[PDB]
Each structure stands twice: as C-alpha cells, then as structure tokens.
Amino acid sequence: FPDLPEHQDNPSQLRLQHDGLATDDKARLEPMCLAEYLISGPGGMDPDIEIDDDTYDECREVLSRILEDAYTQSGTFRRLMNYAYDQELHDVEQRWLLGAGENFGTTVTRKVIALNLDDTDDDSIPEYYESNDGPQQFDTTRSFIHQVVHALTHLQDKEDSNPRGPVVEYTNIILKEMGHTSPPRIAYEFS
Amino acid sequence: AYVEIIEQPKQRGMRFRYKCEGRSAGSIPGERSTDTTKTHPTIKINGYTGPGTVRISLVTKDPPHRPHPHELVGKDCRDGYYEADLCPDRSIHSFQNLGIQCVKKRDLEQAISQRIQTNNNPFHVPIEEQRGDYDLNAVRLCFQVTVRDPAGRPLLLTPVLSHPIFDN
Ligand SMILES: [Cl-]
Ligand SMILES: [Cl-]
C-alpha cells in the first residue's frame, strides 16, 4: 500500500497490520452517501449537554465534502471507509454521533465524533503539528480526516516506539493522496 | 520572594476537552498569542534563584477559590494538576503542555472527592464548602511555587491566580 518517505524508516507497525485487514481500495460506495453512512445524528461527548442544530448542519456539510473528496481521491481512505462500512456503518444503528462545534475528538476506548470549524476562526489561536518544515497549523481537512480515521480504525495515537502512531500516518498518506499540500506530520507531540 | 505571572493564559478561544482521542494534546495559549506567534502561560520568580517545585491546579473563578472539578492534563500532570521541578538555573518558567479536561456533569461529586483525597486544595477550603453549584464554564490557574530557604528546606511561596479561562 502506498506510504510516505517520512514513514518508511520506522513506519508505524499498527497501521501496517490494520492494512492486513482493510484491503478493499475499490470505489464501490457512492461518495455523496458517506456522511449518512458515518453519522446518525447530533450528539456530544457529554450526554447531558446538547448540540446546536445549526452548527450541526454547518459541520455536516463540510464533513460531507471532505468525505466525498477523500473517497474519490484516496485509495488508502477507500480502504478504511470500505472496511468500516462492512463491519458497522452499513447498520443504521451502528453510526456515530456528530458532536458539531465541540473540541476535536472521537470515542475509541455511545460513539461520538466531535468536529468544529474553529480552524477558520480568528478568535481561536491556531494549533500546530510538527513537520520537517517547522510547525504547521492544523487545517480543517487534516483535523476532520484525523478524527474520522480514529472512527474508521478504532485505533489510538499512542503507539509504543513510534513517534506518530497509526492515525497520524494514515492521515498523512490520505492527505497526500488528496493533493493536500501541507507537509506530513512527523511526530504526534512536539520536541 | 514572590511569583509573578508575566504571560497570562488567554481567556477565550480554547475549548475544554473530554476523554477521547483528539488530534493533539492541546496547550493553553498565552494572552499575547496571535496567528503568527502562539505564546504559553509563563511565570517569573522574583527574589529567589535555585531548585524548586511548581504545582499548577484549577480553582473556581470566584472566592472562596475551591479546587475545580475539572482536570489539568498533559505532560507532568497527575490527578488533575501539573507538578514538575523548576529549571534550577532560570527565574522564568513557561508551561507549554497544559490542557483542561472537563468532567461530565454526572461525575462532579466524584471529581470533588478526588480533589480532597489528593490534597489538591491551594487555599485549604473546608470540605463543608466544597458542595453546591460549580461554574463548569470557567476556571483559574493557581500557581503554587515551592522554593528553598537558606538551609535548603522547602519554602512555599504565596499562591498566585491567573485570569479566568472560559470554555463557552
Ligand atoms: Cl499548538
Ligand atoms: Cl494528523
């Protein structure tokens, strides 16, 4: 499977074995239905707290575009999505809650995917990741794909003896396959 | 000697996080942060140089500053507070890995009891005080610096509280 030069020297060992299971890179799902396949309805990390119906539509619209682009452009992403569809997403009652407007996150260890559009918001300070070209700002595409990759693989960023982990490496590869210009993320935490 | 906050945490723009897999371990930005140069909360120790400890904990916005049910998380954090050795050869200290993790409303009493069990109570607020409503949208950073007296015995300096940090 395609990989990056920034990985192949000490590549993630957890991604490489999830690849052993996600092998169908074919474009057999319809891109404009991926959002419905992934998201059931609004719902935040906290049951008691509730999501704004308006921000839900805003975030879902953006999420749908990114899912569509990633599936049409990235064979690596088609593998994760296809596999996930066969296991759970085909079931209307196995889908994720979209915690729109909440801090980026997804429940891995009730299933929630928390996304927001603050990456485009002046009033927030950018958050950064480490690359060979110096610190890079997180953008919507990377943040959305990173959280979605969590939800399609059920994997964590914590990998013993790998500075990136499986989700970062997947995200790096998918974004490059999408024509995303951002430098790949060489480490999960700074140093 | 006394502690001085020379870079306050930024009050707004950063959401408290939950227990989940995120994109990164966030760092509370400093008040002077921009899209060009992000900053981090920073303190200065006046009148003392040498080894020491600093603990950072969360307390309520209004006095009496009870220990907040939320947690600080990130490098060198445990049981909801940050604690690490001071660089012994500097008087300026920045904290670039601070994160705020909010407790679910249903686990509030559980968090408060952990604050008590772990002796995380900067202003020694009585137990009978630590019930009632908490503002889960706002917290203050409490910097508790321990330096040394001339004989090398630990000497706790007066705590200093930051501006409030809001979730929205
Ligand atoms: Cl950052
Ligand atoms: Cl990433």
Side-chain angles (χ1 to χ4, degrees), chain A residues 45-46 48-49 103-106 119 123-128 137-138 143 146-147 150 156-157 185 188, chain B residues 10 12-13 15-27 29 33-36 38 104-106:
Chain A
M45 294 287 174
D46 188 354
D48 301 13
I49 313 173
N103 195 64
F104 282 111
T106 68
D119 285 358
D123 310 49
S124 296
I125 307 299
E127 292 201 83
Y128 294 83
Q137 298 197 8
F138 277 109
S143 305
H146 185 105
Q147 299 305 334
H150 274 296
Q156 306 186 307
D157 291 295
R185 183 180 186 183
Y188 184 80
Chain B
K10 194 173 198 300
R12 310 192 170 266
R15 313 294 164 257
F16 306 165
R17 67 187 85 163
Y18 290 91
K19 286 205 80 198
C20 62
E21 282 289 331
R23 65 182 175 170
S24 68
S27 53
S33 295
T34 67
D35 307 321
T36 316
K38 177 168 168 170
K104 310 195 185 168
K105 171 59 195 305
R106 294 171 183 171

Side-chain angles (χ1 to χ4, degrees), chain A residues 45 97-106 112-116 147, chain B residues 20:
Chain A
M45 294 287 174
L97 290 173
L98 176 59
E102 305 297 327
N103 195 64
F104 282 111
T106 68
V112 175
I113 288 163
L115 306 168
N116 67 76
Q147 299 305 334
Chain B
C20 62

Side-chain angles (χ1 to χ4, degrees), chain A residues 13 34 62 74 93 144 146 160:
Chain A
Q13 293 296 327
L34 300 167
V62 173
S74 179
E93 279 285 347
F144 273 51
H146 185 105
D160 289 345

